[PDB]
């Protein structure tokens, strides 16, 4: 129990093996005695094995108290120990035929077939009683008495002959004495023939019964004189025929033990240097059948596991905690399954002792071993083969297998996913209120919660005298208590989860604050990251404890430092909703406002000026001043325009300096919410503006300034929302009555439209452009009678301009139900969203978890070019372009360097380098990262989320795969499109690229079109014959005759197999592609995700080549391989770990082949060590980070 184990390995449990493991073999098929109810002696839950029921306690009871321990009872037979080892020790049992391993039987492709080459229909016939298999033969005697057999055959078959050719005789020679009595008797011409179709028929079947005995014979003799071990004989008349005579030359069996033997004597060096035979033709698959099975039995070769294995002779039995047996609320008893499946199999195994020690017949013995090897497979893998079995009900029983995966079965979430103390949740209530570092938490939710620390408080506080008075005091809830609840929970960070949880800021830390009421108030402006509707939504709360838990919290996973998208790095925490109508509303400028600014006239000066925000506050409360009017003032404390103030300064910005400018006094207000250090704005503001704003504050300043900024904006919002008049009445909806009278007028030219087409006007295509130029015509002229008659400040315009965010007249029963006809599919189709997106974000998860950063630079000079920017700004700089790292310094034209290489490539670096006017940038990437182990900080680039330098820990894969998944319940060119790429599958309608430069001839076939590539070498043409013209063709224009095209152009519309680019363009263009497809479905959604996310996802897929002749690249440096292309679940299926890679799919064959191939897991990944409860090898787990001495400077001492 050290917590720290280097390597975690398997192997075939050897009869030994599960001999030793067990503490005594379990005999009866008994459970507990149905009176006493105590467990049965020599019987499953035998306590004199498997443990006793109570600590320290015998069964009998002469050994009562914990006084002697380590001792046996020498009555009952049980040991005096604690009562847990009942839930760790094992039995066994001893069959009494060998049995088969169903795993290695029918778990496909055969193990045992493969490793014997007898096919599993072949080898299903063997161990289950169905055919003989020839285990022995004697050669030196079967050739030194080969002549004397052939001459006892030929005359024993000639004996045949002679009774043959002489029976027809004596047929035919009757049949002519019957004949001729004819011509002596009426002749009925009609009889003549009867007869003798009769007779001749007669003689067909003497003739060919013999016939069949002739080719028996012939069966016999062949079969023996070939002969040879392996060999089925499914006959059983002809095995014993063979076995009368011959008996003494060779020997065959039935069921597992003579597989059992075909092992014994199998020499695993020599079956595998025949196997060597990598000549002999092999391009055909009979060398690949070779192949496929040289795989099993070479690891048997190189590992020293006995496949002898394969075939028990013991089974273990599991403790009973793990089946136990108790007695249900209600008298009533529950039992697992597993105990009516080892009954089934000491009941059979049992029976046949029996059936051996009473010399009972071998169909009675056979039977009993078909249905002993039945019982196991059952116990082992119900179901596996044949019907499973089934108990009362006919629910199939639950097996061992069963019980191991399963999706909430111990494999994959029960042993993954627990239930955890210090815990709670209830339904979520808005906290408009509240700081963005705090969250409201019901008194009752924090008391039960930190029940153990008010205790201790309450005890060292002489308010309770000991633990068991601080509980009850507790418990009754006094109210002493509530103030020290307040003491324990302060500065005591809280852990907030919404379901589900799709990307990592789905669970963020909080102050708790005591909140009168049993709901938990949320912040307004996390309710983006949880997704957190407030219509009875429920969250979770959990308690770190911990030292460093608590540090994880308040550093890592603190709300108001998590405010940028880790996916787009774009902000979250951005005022929404109602935050933004009330700031758009705040600093919308009305012209002819109430206290408006004018012009000084001819006798009077300006009146709109005010000497500061103060005064202009004194007269917004009067009458006079309008918060939205075009006033001009002075401000002090306020910072002027970058552009304007260059003109009133260039000495130095405002620091108490006072400046003039025309805003409004909303504007003002609301800069005032902005750092002091940030310079005017003087906008109605938007969610992009806003959106605009917090960003270029977010890169210039600490997320604490843009915390605080961030909630400023939130009360202003809010409060200005409530003065923004808005509200719904009918006035604000109704209908514009002209479109329902001009919808009337356009539906007129619509139908005699088709009346003037009916009579020979159609003219064709004139109708379709023409109905829909009148269709068009009125979609548009009702959008103007509609957004003409809405106010410029009506409230739905005013929700919709500012970017928070036509059954009127009523519809009668017929058109209420075709309304529903495509509702439902919406609520149907969007079902299946969310299913595959989990689905696919478990295999992304699954491929992606174990990357990380492990060095700060690997110092490759590889990078990728983009395109940044084509007008002469790109539309999609924004994902690929922005957060990047340069591998080559950005040289202009005119010889000036701008921006150095290694450099944060920050939108301000953007625009320098769009200043020189560069189309294209080279840039790290997780492509080209040369690390080792995972990638390194420089290649991967910026954080997003941070928005500085990734750190050295940052698991960054798993953090692609959410941010990939997560916006998978956008998708519609869909989910199916993503999940063809990422699983490397070849295209739906594939596509084909040019193998080569040059041009193209276009020849246009009614079967199909044909493209041939005249290359400029110019060397053989390269044809592309087979194209349908349902895919139409590439866009540059269209790809026309006589174009040129490049090495890795796309010839026409569709999308192109992966594989057939990686072994044209090569890895690096592959992962360039895969990118850019899998990119386009997504921002087709207008999903941002930058493209590292993709990278990192994509790397792992090109991280294996192909080994031809003698897997991962670093192998090679330390036998010629190709580069491989394959999907996230084969890659992962290919991961070293095998405990990591049986959790995440068919754990059956990745156990199968772990224990063949007696792997060892080195617990590298953090998968494992999450299973074990091993720090994982990321973040806080990374050795640099956990092996941290913390001592003070001797400085500090001396102060005290
Ligand atoms: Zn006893
Ligand atoms: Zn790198």
Redesign the pocket.
């Known amino acids: 129990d050290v917590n720290f184990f280097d390597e975690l390995r398997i192997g075939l449990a050897t009869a030994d093996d599960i001999r030793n493991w067990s503490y005594g073999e379990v005999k009866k098929p008994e459970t507990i005695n149905y009176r006493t109810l105590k467990p049965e002696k020599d019987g499953l839950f035998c306590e004199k094995i498997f443990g006793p029921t109570r600590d320290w306690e015998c069964y009998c009871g002469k050994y009562k108290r914990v006084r002697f321990k380590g001792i046996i009872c020498e009555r009952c037979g049980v040991e005096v120990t604690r009562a847990k080892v009942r839930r760790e020790r094992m039995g066994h049992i001893e069959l009494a035929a060998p049995v088969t391993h169903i795993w290695y039987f029918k778990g496909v492709p055969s193990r045992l077939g493969y490793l014997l080459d007898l096919a599993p229909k072949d080898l299903e016939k063997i161990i289950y009683f169905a055919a003989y298999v020839i285990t022995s033969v004697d050669d030196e005697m079967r050739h030194n008495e080969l002549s004397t057999l052939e001459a006892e055959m030929a005359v024993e078959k000639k004996a045949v002959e002679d009774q043959r050719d002489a029976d027809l005789e004596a047929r035919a020679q009757k049949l002519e004495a019957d004949l001729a009595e004819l011509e002596a008797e009426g002749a009925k011409s009609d009889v003549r023939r009867k007869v003798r179709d009769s007779g001749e028929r007669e003689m067909r079947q003497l003739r060919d019964r013999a016939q069949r005995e002739l080719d028996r014979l012939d069966e016999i003799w062949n079969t023996f004189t070939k002969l040879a071990p392996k060999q089925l004989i499914v006959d059983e008349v002809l095995y014993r025929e063979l076995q009368d005579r011959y008996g003494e030359y060779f020997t065959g069996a039935m069921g597992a033990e003579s597989i059992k033997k075909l092992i014994e004597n199998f020499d695993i060096d020599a079956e595998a240097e025949s196997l060597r035979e990598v000549i002999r033709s092999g391009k055909g698959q009979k060398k690949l059948r070779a192949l496929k099975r040289l795989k099993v039995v070479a690891a048997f070769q190189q590992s020293g596991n006995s496949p002898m294995g394969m075939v028990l002779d013991a089974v273990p039995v599991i403790p009973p905690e793990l089946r136990p047996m108790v007695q249900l609320d209600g008298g009533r008893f529950a039992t697992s399954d597993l105990n009516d499946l080892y009954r089934r199999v000491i009941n059979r195994n049992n029976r046949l002792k029996r059936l051996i020690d009473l010399g009972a017949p071998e169909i009675i013995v056979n039977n009993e071993k078909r249905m002993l090897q039945e019982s196991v497979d059952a116990l082992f893998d119900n179901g596996r083969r044949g019907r499973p079995v089934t108990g009362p009900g006919n629910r199939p029983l639950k097996s061992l297998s069963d019980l191991l995966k399963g999706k909430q079965g111990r494999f994959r979430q029960n042993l993954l996913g627990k239930r955890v103390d210090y815990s709670g949740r209830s339904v979520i209530v808005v906290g408009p209120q509240l700081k963005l570092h705090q969250c409201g938490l019901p008194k009752l939710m924090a008391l039960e919660l930190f029940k153990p620390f008010v205790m201790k408080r309450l005890v060292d506080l002489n308010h309770a005298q000991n633990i068991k008075s601080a509980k009850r005091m507790v418990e009754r809830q006094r109210p002493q208590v509530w103030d020290v609840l307040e003491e324990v929970i302060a500065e005591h960070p809280v852990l907030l989860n919404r379901a589900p949880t799709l990307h990592r800021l789905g669970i963020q830390a909080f102050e708790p604050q005591l909140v009168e009421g049993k709901a938990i108030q949320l912040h307004p402006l996390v309710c983006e990251a949880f997704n957190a509707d407030f219509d009875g939504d429920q969250m979770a709360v959990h308690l770190p404890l911990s030292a460093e838990a608590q540090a994880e919290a308040r550093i890592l996973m603190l709300s108001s430092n998590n405010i940028l998208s880790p996916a787009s790095g774009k902000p979250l925490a951005m005022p929404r909703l109602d935050m933004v109508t009330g700031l758009y509303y705040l600093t919308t400028l009305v012209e002819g406002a109430t206290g408006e600014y004018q012009a000084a006239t001819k006798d009077a000066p300006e009146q709109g000026v005010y000497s500061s925000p103060a005064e202009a506050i004194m007269a917004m409360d009067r009458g006079a001043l309008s918060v939205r009017a075009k006033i001009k003032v002075r401000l002090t404390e306020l910072r002027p325009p970058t552009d304007l103030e260059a003109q009133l300064f260039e000495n130095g910005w405002k620091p108490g300096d006072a400046w003039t400018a025309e805003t409004t006094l909303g504007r003002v207000m609301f800069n005032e919410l902005l750092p002091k250090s940030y310079p005017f704005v003087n906008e109605q503001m938007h969610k992009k503006v806003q959106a605009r704003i917090i960003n270029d504050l977010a890169e210039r300043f600490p997320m604490i300034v843009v915390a605080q900024t961030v909630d400023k904006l939130k009360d202003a919002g809010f409060y200005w929302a409530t003065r923004s008049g808005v509200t719904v009445s009918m006035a604000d909806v109704l209908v514009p009555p002209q479109k329902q009278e001009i919808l009337e007028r356009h539906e007129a030219e619509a139908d005699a439209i088709e009346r003037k087409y009916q009579r020979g006007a159609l003219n064709h295509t004139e109708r379709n452009e023409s109905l829909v130029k009148i269709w068009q015509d009125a979609t548009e002229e009702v959008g103007k009678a509609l957004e003409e008659f809405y106010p410029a400040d009506n409230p739905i315009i005013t929700i919709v301009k500012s970017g928070a965010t036509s059954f009127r007249e009523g519809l009668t029963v017929l058109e209420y139900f075709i309304n529903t006809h495509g509702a439902r599919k919406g609520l149907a189709d969007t079902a299946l969203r969310t299913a595959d997106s989990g689905y696919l974000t478990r295999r992304l998860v699954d491929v992606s978890q174990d990357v990380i950063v492990r060095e700060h630079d690997?110092e490759?000079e590889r990078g990728i070019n983009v395109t940044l920017a084509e007008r002469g700004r790109d539309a999609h700089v924004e994902t690929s372009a922005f957060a990047r790292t340069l591998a080559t310094d950005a040289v202009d034209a005119n010889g000036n360097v701008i921006i150095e290489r290694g450099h944060d490539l920050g939108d301000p670096a953007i625009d320098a380098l769009l200043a020189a006017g560069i189309t294209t940038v080279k840039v790290?990437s997780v492509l080209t990262?040369?690390?080792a182990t995972g990638?390194?900080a420089?290649?991967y680039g910026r954080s997003m989320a941070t928005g500085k330098l990734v750190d050295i820990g940052e698991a960054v894969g798993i953090v692609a795969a959410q941010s990939i998944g997560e916006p998978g319940t956008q998708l519609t060119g869909g989910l199916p499109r993503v999940q063809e790429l990422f699983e490397a599958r070849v295209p739906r309608n594939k596509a084909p690229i040019a193998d080569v430069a040059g041009r193209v001839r276009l020849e246009e076939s009614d079967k199909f079109f044909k493209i041939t590539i005249v290359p400029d070498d110019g060397g053989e043409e390269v044809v592309y014959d087979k194209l349908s013209k349902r895919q139409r063709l590439r866009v540059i224009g269209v790809l026309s005759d006589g174009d040129h095209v490049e090495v890795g152009d796309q010839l026409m519309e569709g999308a192109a197999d992966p594989h057939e680019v990686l072994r044209v363009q090569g890895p690096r263009e592959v992962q360039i592609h895969l990118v850019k497809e899998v990119q386009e479905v997504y921002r087709a959604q207008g999903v941002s995700i930058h493209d590292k996310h993709i990278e990192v996802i994509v790397r792992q897929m090109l991280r294996r080549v192909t080994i031809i002749d003698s897997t991962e690249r670093a192998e090679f440096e330390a036998a010629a391989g190709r580069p491989v292309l394959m999907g996230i679940t084969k890659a992962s299926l290919a991961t070293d770990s095998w405990l990591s890679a049986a959790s995440f799919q068919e754990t059956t064959r990745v156990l199968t082949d772990a224990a063949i191939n007696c792997r060892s897991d080195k617990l590298n990944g953090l998968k494992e060590n999450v299973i074990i409860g091993k720090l994982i090898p990321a973040g806080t787990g990374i050795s640099r980070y956990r092996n941290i001495q913390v001592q003070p400077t001797e400085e500090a001492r001396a102060a005290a």
Request: glycine share 0%.
């Open positions: 690997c490759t790290r990262c040369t690390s990638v390194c420089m290649c």
